């Protein structure tokens, strides 16, 4: 129990984690199925007990690295899973290793997920930080006050459309 | 204005010369097309469950009946590859056609005439745009009026001179602490408050925040003459 | 604005817990990688749409603690700092009125990638845009922010549609009540009518249906003796087991290709909708639009965006 | 399989990896041991008949 093992119960072969099940089966019911109709839980033929079957290989794997010409340092991101196997840090996007968490917020360089972005910055290494939404500007508001520009600059903006 | 425009053109030239990622929008299309073509070409090497991925090898090994089954599998695989490639190409072509319609609208409005749409020709108040031929696309040089510096000034929705509220015809009323002057929202150019620059409506007891000031009458010097 | 981000693992989805099945997929070759890359590109395009639609400025604006807008009550649209997650009263219904399946899909190889932009940050973008519109009007998106009283902003907006601004300062008291009544009516309609966000509910339902169909197609026999790879491996010899697994792979790959094509078509539709939403944010919300009915029925004055799940809701003010 | 950089290079089929985030594969967990549980039957089937 509480381990990823290859199980062969009543001729049913598969891989998953066996744990005590909170679901109550009827006396005649033996094989359980999930919403997808795949294997969910079964009853041990010898000692009647319900065991939940959870498929292994939780989440995915992602690689965060800058341009090879800059540096070869990389950070591994595990999606929607906590640090199990494993510079071990956690974030909204899941377990993240190889990146240093920084409270300071900077412009999004390499997206991570859930409002998290990583960048290669200063003796330089990958860092993890909350995505910056732009410089905070508080414009004063008053009924009797207005702002009329005293100077102007004509700028040309480059736009490309296929 | 000419100096600023020339400086902006030079800056764009330098950025394009140094930073090649500026054309990343077209580079993405080029890379996607190249990747699709390469994948379709490489699928010819896939066995797709057959003994060999080469049609000639199958034809030179098995009998007509077994060769027929093997070639049926190979043709099924290659036809699936072709259908996937054609679907991807159709989706990308629909996206590029939508972008081409957008670019045609951008040209017709920004370049030919003047476009009042916000940010459609780019950030800031648009004046004119200059298209530039690019491979499998086009690059637009959007000229816009962006205010640089601003200074806070005292304002009032109306001026009370003779009990009747006066409202700006165009622009807004501002004051630097000496007198109330008329200027536009987008630029600072004080002007003398006068009837020609305002109109009479309502009264001073209805308008909220109205202030008292003298409105210049152009006929006053002429009548006294 | 954004579509549900899904990264289906073409390896685990078809050949999950199977090695010979993976070897057979190697014979087919690049379809698995191409589908994975297509789904990753779909997610990237959805993130790009979110960034282009919600983010229209490089700065964040906040309203002053003391508010005097001439009678309008924006508390319904403005964020409430007391809430655990910043949001307005209207956004409460927007998020609540739009809808385990997720665990079952994940166990089948359907990875739900969280959006690059969180609902909290979407709310902050909306709050910044609303503050810019309220204080700086249309000047915060065209360059340096210029503070302008809201009454004069409405005066200029009326002048732009052909209505002399003299009407504004005369009706300032009645227009405030009209706007407050309209906001209250919208709040009540959203609270009572859950179909108001049916536009986003349709996208959510389409995504859920596609994911459910993709998951269910695994249980299909697809011409094979059984729909379970483990059963085939434990039943037939390598030769016949390979034939059965090949049939299952063909069926599941056809299903996945159809799913990917339909998802790409939906993503193209969402991209068009996001371009329209960004144009509307630029014109109706930021500045003023002379386009007829583009911002809604009547002569448009200004628009107040509101955050919604996998999309955005615009409150367009019209004369 | 040397480091995440090499895995990304193999996934992209190129030694030049541009700045960004890329997905290579899933997170795999190898089973610890094979578990077999079958009903207790001590009688051989009547193959004689």
UniProtKB/Swiss-Prot annotation, chain D:
Glycans are attached at residues 32, 34, 40. It comes from Severe acute respiratory syndrome coronavirus 2. The gene is S. This is Spike protein S1. Attaches the virion to the cell membrane by interacting with host receptor, initiating the infection. The major receptor is host ACE2. When S2/S2' has been cleaved, binding to the receptor triggers direct fusion at the cell membrane. When S2/S2' has not been cleaved, binding to the receptor results in internalization of the virus by endocytosis using host TFRC and GRM2 and leading to fusion of the virion membrane with the host endosomal membrane. Alternatively, may use NRP1/NRP2 and integrin as entry receptors. Binds to host ACE2. RBD also interacts with the N-linked glycan on 'Asn-90' of ACE2. Cleavage of S generates a polybasic C-terminal sequence on S1 that binds to host Neuropilin-1 (NRP1) and Neuropilin-2 (NRP2) receptors. Interacts with host integrin alpha-5/beta-1 (ITGA5:ITGB1) and with ACE2 in complex with integrin alpha-5/beta-1 (ITGA5:ITGB1). May interact via cytoplasmic c-terminus with M protein. May interact (via N-terminus) with host bilirubin and biliverdin, thereby preventing antibody binding to the SARS-CoV-2 spike NTD via an allosteric mechanism. Residues 28-44 are annotated as: Disordered.
